[PDB]
Each structure stands twice: as structure tokens, then as C-alpha cells.
A and B are shown apart, each in its own frame.
Chain A
Amino acid sequence: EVVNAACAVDAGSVDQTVQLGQVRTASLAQEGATSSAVGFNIQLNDCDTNVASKAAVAFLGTAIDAGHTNVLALQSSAAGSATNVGVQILDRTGAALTLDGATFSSETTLNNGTNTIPFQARYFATGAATPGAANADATFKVQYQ
């Protein structure tokens, strides 16, 4: 009787990274302005499709400010980072995801012989954007049944 092992998680790039492209600050003029969204796939590999499909996932991250808790704060720069802009993570349907321990079902597909879940990331304006490095971090959390 052999025990099931958990999945090896990936996120497109091997550095678990996602290119958000430039930040057109003139196009992020006021609160609620948003960049065009870049898609990325999380992959659950080397595990029984039952374990992956059954798992429940969520996104964790520090909000840009108390006013926008579903938007990520930018990673702060030494030269200083862009302001009044954050990163927002959407599901396959363009809907924005929360950033707390608010977990949800993975909805994995055996697309590409492996259990993959699509996502999107974009910039969300919080006021007038101001130029600056606009990196961002987030923990993906996979909880197993």
C-alpha cells in the first residue's frame, strides 16, 4: 500500500516569476485605472490528479493600503518604487482574487498531461501613478485534503 505524494507546484517561469511589462504611468492616471492583464499558469505536477483536483488554493500578500486589500503592495525599491499603483491577481475570468487566507477549490485541468490552473496579473491604480520600479511578491498556498 503506497501513500500519495503531494504536487510539485510551478508558475510558468522557473524563477516563479511573471512579467508584468512596463507601467504606462500616463495611462494609470486615476484610482481604478488598470493595466492590460498578463496571464500565467500554475502547474501541479507529479501527483495523483485526485490530490491536485481535490486540493484547495489561495493567494497571500500584503495589501497596497488599508483601502485596497485585494491589491498587492509593490516591492519597495532602493531608488524608490512607483506610487499609487499595485498588483492585482485575477482568476481565469478576469475577476480579482482576495489576498487573505481566503482559500478556494483549485479547478485543475489535465491540460498538457499535467494539472494546470490559469491566472492573470495586472496593475491597479490607487491614484495617479508615479514612475518607479514596480515588482511585487505573493505566496500561493496549497492546502491538501
Chain B
Amino acid sequence: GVALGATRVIYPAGQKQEQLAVTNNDENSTYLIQSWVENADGVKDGRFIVTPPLFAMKGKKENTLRILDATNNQLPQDRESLFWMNVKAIPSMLTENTLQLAIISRIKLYYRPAKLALPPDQAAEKLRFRRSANSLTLINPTPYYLTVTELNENALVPPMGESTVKDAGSNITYRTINDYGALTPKMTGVM
């Protein structure tokens, strides 16, 4: 099977390109790898260009995809902007009667402006909460897309936005997945 080198990709504005590794751990097989970017609405609007859009992997190898900013600088420059990287691995081989399977790895592609005020190290620590009888509202005052998980459903709270999740209790804890697809320490919710 083939995997990507990351769970997410941060694209700093001004950067000409970014790399993303693709690895076929199997030496006895061949895949066709077709990858493309979509926007927050899953529409392939071509704001970001992936090369190569389509290429073959035969056996134990590692290829590198290149993601190029072609937004013409028209994305918001005050806050992150969400996109999706989609890399589709398609097997290629015959005995009859089988289910053939292709795999899609879909990861977040964050367009991050420059000269941002709040360092990314300390963004999660700003998460605020608003309980409502049967619904908890998470408030994210940061220009960063906050990814809340182990919140006691998960939540992706957009920058300068909010996000609501549906006999719940009182005290609340959470943590987040940082730029390194890794987990921040646990934190206590604040109203």
C-alpha cells in the first residue's frame, strides 16, 4: 500500500511550492497515483496546482508531489484558508470475480498568510466554550484553523469562527492536532 508523508500541509504564502512525499511500501506491486486539490467545498477550483497530477509507482519507491500556489494572491490575508489534498492510489494488474479497490488519502491543505501576529505555538490555548442545554459551542478567535479532538464529537473550528457540537456533564477537557499532525497537551475548557 501507498502512504503520504504527512497528515496535513501548511502552505505559507509567498512560497513558490511545497513538497509532499508519496511512498509505495510494496515492491511487488504497481499503482497509478492521481492527486488533486479541492477547496473547502470539495470543488477542484485550481487555486493550487499539484504536479504530477497523474503518475505511476512500480515497487518500493518514494516520489514527491509538488503543490504550487496559483491563487493570484486573492485569498484572505488575515486568516488561514482551508483546502484539501486528495491523493488517489489505484492498483493495476487475471483470475475472475473480485472486488478491486482504490484508496484516497484526503488531508488538509492550509493556506497561511504571512506576518501573522499570534504565533502558532500558542493558538489552542485560546479556545473558548459556550454551553447550551444540549449543545456546546467552541469559539476560535485565532486566524488558525483549530482541530479539536478528544473533547469530552470532534470539531474543526475555523479561524475567527465558531463550531457547535451536540444529558451532557459539566467540566470539559480537550486537545488539538498541531501543524505536525501531532497532539497538543490536554487542556481544560474555558467559558
Task: Tell yes or no: A17 within 8 A of B by CB.
Answer: yes
Tally of chain B residues near chain A (CB < 8 A): 41
A111-145 interface (Cβ within 8 A of B):
121, 133-145
Measured between beta carbons, the chain A residues less than 8 angstroms from B106 are 141-144
Measured between beta carbons, the chain A residues less than 8 angstroms from B2 are 8-9
Determine the distance from Cα of A34 to Cα of B54 in the docked complex, in whole angstroms: 38
Task: Tell yes or no: B91 within 8 A of A by CB.
Answer: yes
Measured between beta carbons, the chain B residues less than 8 angstroms from A18 are 98-99, 101
User: Does B102 contact A3, Cβ atoms closer than 8 Å?
Assistant: no
User: Does B101 contact A8, Cβ atoms closer than 8 Å?
Assistant: no
Task: Tell yes or no: B17 within 8 A of A by CB.
Answer: no
Tally of chain A residues near chain B (CB < 8 A): 49
Measured between beta carbons, the chain A residues less than 8 angstroms from B107 are 6, 143-144
- B interface, by DSSP: helix, strand, loop or mixed? strand
User: Does A137 contact B103, Cβ atoms closer than 8 Å?
Assistant: no
Task: Tell yes or no: A62 within 8 A of B by CB.
Answer: no
Task: Tell yes or no: B71 within 8 A of A by CB.
Answer: no
User: Does B103 contact A5, Cβ atoms closer than 8 Å?
Assistant: no
Task: Tell yes or no: A45 within 8 A of B by CB.
Answer: yes
Determine the distance from Cα of A145 to Cα of B82 in the docked complex, in whole angstroms: 13
Determine the distance from Cα of A134 to Cα of B99 in the docked complex, in whole angstroms: 9
Shortest CB distance B106–A (Å): 4
Task: Tell yes or no: A11 within 8 A of B by CB.
Answer: yes
Task: Tell yes or no: B128 within 8 A of A by CB.
Answer: no
Determine the distance from Cα of A11 to Cα of B154 in the docked complex, in whole angstroms: 27
A17 nearest CB neighbor, chain B only: B98
A38 nearest CB neighbor, chain B only: B99
Task: Tell yes or no: B13 within 8 A of A by CB.
Answer: no
Contact mask A4-18 → B, CB, 8 Å, 1/0?
111111110011111
Q: Kindly identify which residue among A11, A15, A137 contacts B93, using a CB–CB cutoff of 8 Å.
A: A15
User: Does A5 contact B6, Cβ atoms closer than 8 Å?
Assistant: yes
Interface CB pairs A-B, < 8 A, 17: A2-B180, A3-B8, A5-B6, A9-B105, A11-B103, A15-B93, A40-B99, A45-B1, A133-B96, A134-B96, A134-B97, A136-B100, A137-B101, A138-B101, A139-B104, A144-B105, A144-B181
Q: Given contacts A5-B4, A138-B101, A139-B104, list 11 more A-B pairs with CB under 8 A.
A: A3-B6, A3-B8, A11-B103, A16-B100, A19-B97, A87-B99, A136-B98, A139-B103, A144-B106, A144-B107, A144-B181
